[PDB]
């Protein structure tokens, strides 16, 4: 197994390469992001007339680079994962599971490149392809930024509903009132739909200025309703931002409570002792080891609590027992002397 020892050292470099996407993700991920971003910006600039043809040849030479880099990196990742512990077979299936829909778009874009070169709107199609690629490469860590956002927005669902609802109510009131205020003076507000559009650009504080009140009643209504609702169209940002800061601060304190050594160390031991009940060279005995394993798992999840919430009652019980022992001592002392 000496050649297979070189094979294992191969996997050593293979996992060492696995290190870069996870640990020092900075350089690799950024360079690949620049690849995708450059393709995007060059497509955009190819749309505009000023620089068109040279951008076209650059697009060709860079889409070759895209396809070859992705082709290389497909094999790179597939083999870079667990080579034989995540072996080529059914775990092979699980390497090309759903989220390698990225790989699927890779393959179909290979076909797109081949069609462009030898085979023969189109540009929009290719652009979309680059945008699907954009998405995937900026998200292949399963649920990531999405998971964080979802958790936090779910946490503040109750307040968010209020903000949304009240804001919407204010919008449809304001639009209607102003529409009535000058449906006859302004050609702008010729329809309630026009007023609703004006309301959407007056509440969010965009204010294109394409449609503005002209009557001194319309101006007053716009002013009042703007002052009243603009704030509501700006709450969700405030709530979410503050929730993020709170969560960050909380989690840094929770991790700062790094007390974990002994509970974590004991949990592995209780798990090994339970497991070895069924394979050691050495039912009621097993049931006892399961109960001890469950005690050790909890002690460990109590260090995933900051061990402070239960501590108040913990020390109460300790002090109460001390006082009970003191009472007992005194009582028995009386029973010894006086009787």
């Amino acid at each position: 197994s000496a050649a297979h020892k070189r094979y294992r050292r191969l996997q050593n470099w293979v996992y060492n390469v696995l290190e870069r996407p996870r640990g020092w993700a900075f350089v690799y991920h950024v360079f690949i992001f620049l690849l995708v971003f450059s393709c995007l910006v060059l497509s955009v600039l190819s749309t505009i007339q000023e620089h068109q043809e040279l951008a076209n040849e650059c697009l060709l030479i860079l889409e070759f680079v895209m396809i070859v880099v992705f082709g290389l990196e497909y094999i790179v990742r597939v083999w870079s994962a667990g080579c034989c512990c995540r072996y080529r077979g059914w775990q092979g299936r699980f390497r090309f599971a759903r989220k390698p829909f990225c790989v699927i778009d890779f393959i179909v874009f290979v076909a797109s490149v081949a069609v462009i070169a030898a085979g023969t709107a189109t540009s929009a199609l290719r652009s979309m392809r680059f945008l699907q690629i954009l998405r995937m490469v900026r998200m292949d860590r399963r649920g990531g930024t999405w998971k964080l956002l979802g958790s936090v927005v779910y946490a503040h669902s109750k307040e968010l509903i209020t903000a949304w609802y009240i804001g919407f109510l204010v919008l449809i009131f304001a639009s209607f009132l102003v529409y009535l205020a000058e449906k006859d003076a302004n050609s702008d507000f010729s329809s309630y739909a026009d007023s609703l559009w004006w309301g959407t650009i007056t509440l969010t504080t965009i204010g294109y200025g394409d449609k503005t009140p002209h009557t001194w009643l319309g101006r007053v209504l716009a002013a009042g309703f703007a002052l009243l609702g603009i704030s509501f169209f700006a709450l969700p940002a405030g709530i979410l931002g503050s929730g993020f800061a709170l969560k960050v601060q909380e989690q840094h304190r929770q991790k700062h409570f790094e007390k974990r050594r002994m509970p974590a160390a004991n949990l592995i031991q209780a798990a090994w002792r339970l497991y070895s009940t069924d394979m050691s060279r050495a039912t009621v005995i097993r049931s006892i080891r399961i109960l001890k394993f469950l005690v050790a798992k909890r002690k460990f999840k109590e260090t995933l609590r900051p061990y402070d919430v239960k501590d108040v009652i913990e020390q109460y019980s300790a002090g109460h027992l001390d006082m009970l022992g003191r009472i007992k001592s005194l009582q028995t002392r009386v029973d010894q002397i006086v009787g």
Binding site: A265, Q269, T283, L291, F300
Partner: protein
């Protein structure tokens, strides 16, 4: 039949046929085997499975614990989190010698023979590094 074998073990604790295991029944069987738990350790053990909060284990709670062992996802995650405490690289590896130090020097220390069997059972690499996440799946299978 698996349920009946759990019932027969449960009846060794609850010899009176009352359908419950208290600290008396649990601790009595344990000390007969030469174990010496404290009262507070017997209360903690019963409390892990006592949903009724009355200080007893009934057969449905006993059967649930025995059927489940460590196979649940909570157990797999927490055991893996415990190994990660000792994985500073974050690569999912721990040295055989570092595993040996932690197992025999912290907590309810393993004996030399216990820890020898544990390192034999992990498919140790030629370097001497242990992939503990596949070690966790073997204990959760």
């Amino acid at each position: 039949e698996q349920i009946a074998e759990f019932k027969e073990a449960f009846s060794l604790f609850d010899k009176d046929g009352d359908g419950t295991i208290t600290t008396k029944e649990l601790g009595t069987v344990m000390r007969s085997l030469g174990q010496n738990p404290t009262e507070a350790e017997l209360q903690d053990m019963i409390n892990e499975v006592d949903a009724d909060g009355n200080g007893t284990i009934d057969f449905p709670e006993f059967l649930t614990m025995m059927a489940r062992k460590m196979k649940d996802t909570d157990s797999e995650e927490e055991i893996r989190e415990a190994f990660r405490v000792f994985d500073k690289d974050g690569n999912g590896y721990i040295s055989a010698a570092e595993l040996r130090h932690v197992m025999t020097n912290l907590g309810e220390k393993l004996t030399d023979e216990e820890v020898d069997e544990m390192i034999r059972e992990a498919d140790i690499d030629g370097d001497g590094q242990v992939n503990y996440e596949e070690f966790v799946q073997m204990m959760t299978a």
